[PDB]
Amino acid sequence: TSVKPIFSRDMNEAKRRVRELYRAWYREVPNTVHLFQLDISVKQGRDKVREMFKKNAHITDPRVVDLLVIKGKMELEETIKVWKQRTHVMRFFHETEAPRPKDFLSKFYVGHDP
Amino acid sequence: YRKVRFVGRQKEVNENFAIDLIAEQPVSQVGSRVISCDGGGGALGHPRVYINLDKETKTGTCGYCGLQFRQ
Amino acid sequence: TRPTVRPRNDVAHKQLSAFGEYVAEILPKYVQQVQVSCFNELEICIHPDGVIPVLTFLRDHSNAQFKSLADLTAVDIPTRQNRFEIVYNLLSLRFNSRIRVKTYTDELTPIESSVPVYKAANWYEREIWDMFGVFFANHPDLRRILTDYGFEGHPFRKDFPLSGYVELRYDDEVKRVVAEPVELAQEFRKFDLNSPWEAFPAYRQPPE
Amino acid sequence: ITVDEKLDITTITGVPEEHIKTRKARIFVPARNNMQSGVNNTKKWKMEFDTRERWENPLMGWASTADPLSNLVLTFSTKEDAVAFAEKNGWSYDVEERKVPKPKSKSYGANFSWNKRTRVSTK
Amino acid sequence: LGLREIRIHLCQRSPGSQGVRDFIEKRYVELKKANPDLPILIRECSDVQPKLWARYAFGQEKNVSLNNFSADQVTRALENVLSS
Amino acid sequence: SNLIEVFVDGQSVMVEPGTTVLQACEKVGMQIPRFCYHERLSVAGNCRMCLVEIEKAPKVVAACAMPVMKGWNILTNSEKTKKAREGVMEFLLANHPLDCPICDQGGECDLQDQSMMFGSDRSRFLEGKRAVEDKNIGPLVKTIMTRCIQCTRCIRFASEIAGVDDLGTTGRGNDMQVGTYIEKMFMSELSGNIIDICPVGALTSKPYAFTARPWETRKTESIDVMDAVGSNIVVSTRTGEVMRILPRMHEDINEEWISDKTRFAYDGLKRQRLTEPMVRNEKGLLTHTTWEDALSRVAGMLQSFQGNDVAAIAGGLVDAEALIALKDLLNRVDSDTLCTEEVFPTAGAGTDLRSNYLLNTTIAGVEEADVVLLVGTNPRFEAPLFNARIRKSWLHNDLKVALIGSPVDLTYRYDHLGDSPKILQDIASGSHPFSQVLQEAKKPMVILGSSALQRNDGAAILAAVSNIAQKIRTSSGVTGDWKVMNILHRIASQVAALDLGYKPGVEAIQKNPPKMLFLLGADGGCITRQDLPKDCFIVYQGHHGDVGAPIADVILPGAAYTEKSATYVNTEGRAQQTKVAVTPPGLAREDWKIIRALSEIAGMTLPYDTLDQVRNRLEEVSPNLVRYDDVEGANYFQQASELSKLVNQQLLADPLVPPQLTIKDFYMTDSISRASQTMAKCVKAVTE
Amino acid sequence: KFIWTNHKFNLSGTPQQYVPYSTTRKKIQEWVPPSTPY
Amino acid sequence: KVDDAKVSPPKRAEMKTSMESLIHHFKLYTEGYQVPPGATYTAIEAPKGEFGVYLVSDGSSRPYRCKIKAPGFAHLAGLDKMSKGHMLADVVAIIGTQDIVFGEVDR
Amino acid sequence: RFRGEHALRRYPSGEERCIACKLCEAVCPAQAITIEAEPRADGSRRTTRYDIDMTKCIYCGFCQEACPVDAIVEGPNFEFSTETHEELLYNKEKLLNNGDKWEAEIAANIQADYLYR
């Protein structure tokens, strides 16, 4: 790869950075839940935080994870301040959406194989 | 099935039809070979088109012109 | 040839053939292609190692002022093996001359930004991040301008379709204005317009 | 410099939602709308995705639809970078082959024979 | 049953399957002269590992995978599933 | 070697010594305008549009009909060539009326894509515009002979490939016309295929006539299945409705031509179609119901059935993905007894490397043949483009064709050699001459038709013809590899059906009284309730209701061929996959998914879900079906010709009469041909 | 010729509101079963 | 209009008489013009500023990228320098001097 | 030359001046036109569905300057403002009726302006 990285070098400046801001989210989930005046339980927020980090764990290449670091840090800029007026934080939860079937016999009665 | 959306809405519909209103025209005649059809007036209406009238005395309304043209 | 044909001139085609020639002569480190447009424009193709100093060379001189940064744009080109194309456009105040800087790059490879060199690139440089993901280097404040807060698309590239996925609606289920998958009332009927038979002789491709 | 040469097949994700594994692209050659005979619309590879359902919108009969992509064609240069774009973002695909016709042997003058069969009439 | 049918695969080139291409010259005219009931199948080209299939017993596959045999090794391997 | 460097605009290229200026300039990637020229036709020159100014000459020549001498400078763009391409295409744009609001070729006419690029700006005529009258020929060719710029292109086609000598030139000078002098109708095979050749919109389609303009369609390529040779089509949608087809111009088959039947058979496709599952109701009553009513109705009956009490037939037009889900269901229950509709005799081989079962010669190798002898079929009214390749290869060189049995009207000089089945036995001996020439040819070609092979003497003539066929192969054979013996078909889903391992010819169902049957035949009425036992249910699965849906227990809606990503087999073994353009109407579903959905409501469940996973199963049986568009070199019938000699069944005594009539058998053929009101509209115009 | 008597209005529901509708044809023409006897 | 009529449409009294008028009328609305390739750029005096258009041409009836520069990108990013050291009531009086119009900052 | 409400014209005694040549559709910037045509049994082609999305309609008026047989006309009457979204989608049998609430209003403005254009 004839290309210079962004921040990390190989996997060890990387994996300590994804652990790093996890604590910043972890003290943020109880902090905002009384701030944005919404009403769920706070443990659901801590489950959804680790939901997001664990899903993308299939990467074996640097500067992509580092690209997600810049994406992950920019999320906190609106978050610590008040730039998401009670909707964008609720946008994380697919709440009023009807459930996808995800089962073969269930797909077969409704839909032209979507 | 669709008949419920207009209940108390009276179904504003057209009255006249141009499906067949060509047929009440006094079908024209010349006794020549080829005629212009700048019908409706010049520089408006349908463009100029030339028709052969030799065969069951007619033209075929020129498509564009619409008026029944014959001899 | 006639009236209603643009009368070209040769004086500006001469000096812009003259001026830009000894630019590559005095920096044969970064310049890789120079070309003269047939209507008095100039391109200086630059590998982005010299993204800062060549601007810094055009930042000041006694024979080239060029201190009016007008236009930072961004053009994507798929099927190039390095997609994107950052293109500047700068103006000489004392000389009335236009010249552009074409610098290619790729997605993940960053670019040393022009933050100390120019301070008109404060909102222009962030825009390419929001629309493409081209992470410029060492900018003091990278943020989100001209897009909404929840997008993940960087829409101005070609794989992002015309509508998004995020057609928004309201319900009184509790209070919220909730997102939903996108649903249109009409296809946006896509036509087919490219007529055959090759109206242009001059730009004829190498026939392979 | 910090060059740090390394190797990985670049598969980028997170930018769409789920339609990586769902769909399959198609790379082919558009070949001569045969109402006419202009051959300018060769020489460029194109793409088109899966086609999904088109129902009736029960107020007019419009072709309203789901299937949010459904209209994305790009202009490729050749077969070489045809594959390299489908892998760089990484969803499934299938490739056609370019068809060029016979050269071919056509010669006037042999249409008037002494003993052959190649002989035209009624011209 | 056993059995229902068998499926011969080969390849027209990559000459490891030349024993099968010899086997048709050796035992296809006489191999099907005996047992005129069993519908054995021949298809065109696996092009790598020209397997030999057998399928029977409520639809259960049985694949002997010849790579590159001689003219008698293809003759003896066939009677293993044939007699049983 | 054997070339001249000609500097086309001052740039070298090496052509053959004796080609054309047009093919030279088209080789370097340029277009000179083309009116009186076609590659697939002969060459005339009476439009005079291609005019290039050759260097070192004051005159101007035309690039259609002249050879190329020692290397010129073909000066394409000059200050005189543009004084010619402007010149000629100012005259013919005067004596012409002001159409195209209403001219149905209004988005592709060659007076409309030449006239922006080439040619002048305004007009100076300024009155005139002669106007001739039109007529009618057949109920297919909408006919405005006014426009008719007399490029002599439809005229030569009567002397070309379609051998009907019908048209001519009537008149002199300004006043000449093109149509037939008398009011004789013109209709045969390929007769609707002129309206592509007419380069202006003077000729057009009659049913398509006033529908939609050609800048709104979405061109998606596909394949038609109404014949065994396949096709190369392109459909065009409007709002999810089928508008029309055109030939896709493949270079092996469907050169610029297409079947005249398949062109206007799309009308009945959207006419008489069953959309929804209809329940038994105990009498001849048959009413619709929930899709989850008739699934569990037959699901319990499957587990009750076991052994040879359940069977199936399939001989229509369905794909090669629903003919495996059927096969992996009825042989996972291990009760096969299954057959097709078509009658093909099997005595020694056919399923086992198949050795002759495809058309062995390629269509591209037909033109290299020298003496052709074929028996027992009508080549004109089945596989229509097959005779077109014979017609063209009869021309342009020597080609010898004889025929045995039932003289029908072929175009070229054939000859009735004789009419008895004993002719086939005596040609192994020396009698009824040509006698040696089949051996003394260099590329012989002996073709058998499936219509005479349908008879009861089919296994007899199978070894009788192959007797003298291998006799020529054991002679030399040609030089050479040159497979000689070959055979044809007329049902599309037969060769794809048999090479899965089916048995041909209705015999297994002809001997037992099975209880439940699956109909994929289906309109071919060789199986009724008369040969069946008593009122036990038989299930129909298909798309139309011509023959077999009234005589049924439970019908199933399904997509026809323009709705599913299908896979077919031609008469040589290629695989030309169709693709989805319009999604099917009603509650019908794709015809392989229903079997897996019927499998999951039954006991056994098939181990593949998506269409890729279907093709992984399709890999297992035969690997040539995923090999797209290739015919591998594999004959291997030295042994298989000997194995059929085990059977020595004798002939019959009957004149070899085909089912094909004069013309009328060509129209009402498959299922949609009966349902199409267009074919019914024209077939009453022939008997009148 | 083809012109109205006096005038009209662009009112919301008079009761009449013009209630715009679809003006096309059924395309697929679903199959009819045979009758009550076998 | 321009007379050569590969760009201008012909007159209404002309598109109803001759043959040459319709084919260079009916085709000129199905597709557009035929623009040669090669990049271009210009700007003029908008009454509040320059007006950059970097119109990338491809070679068909449909253009490629069309990036615009409007004023307000410069004229309002420099509100950071201009504002400070001053009141809050100053800030509304600043904005109506640059004459900033939104929808025009959509460049 | 003021723009406004859509309407359709016809010849002397009624003929449907429209010929359904689809050109107004291909230049509408909002694609507010949708036309399905069909050969009527007399033989000359006419329309079956004809739509103007008066919501989507951005009033570029190019339909008035694209019809060769001069069919569609931007009629100068700003009389509007119904109460539903479900009403302003104009079908055909509004437009011929709306083209026949008046014609002398329309027929005098074209006849005073057709010399310029």
Ligand code: SF4
């Ligand atoms: S149909 Fe018309 S265009 Fe075609 S060859 Fe005949 S005269 Fe020429």
Ligand code: SF4
């Ligand atoms: S066929 Fe050619 S000349 Fe005739 S109307 Fe169409 S474009 Fe015009």
Ligand code: SF4
């Ligand atoms: S205005 Fe022109 S394009 Fe529109 S419907 Fe009428 S004739 Fe057709």
Ligand code: SF4
């Ligand atoms: S009025 Fe405007 S929006 Fe409507 S069709 Fe005409 S140009 Fe298009």
Ligand code: FES
């Ligand atoms: S192009 Fe046919 S003669 Fe010139």
Ligand SMILES: [Zn+2]
């Ligand atoms: Zn007229």
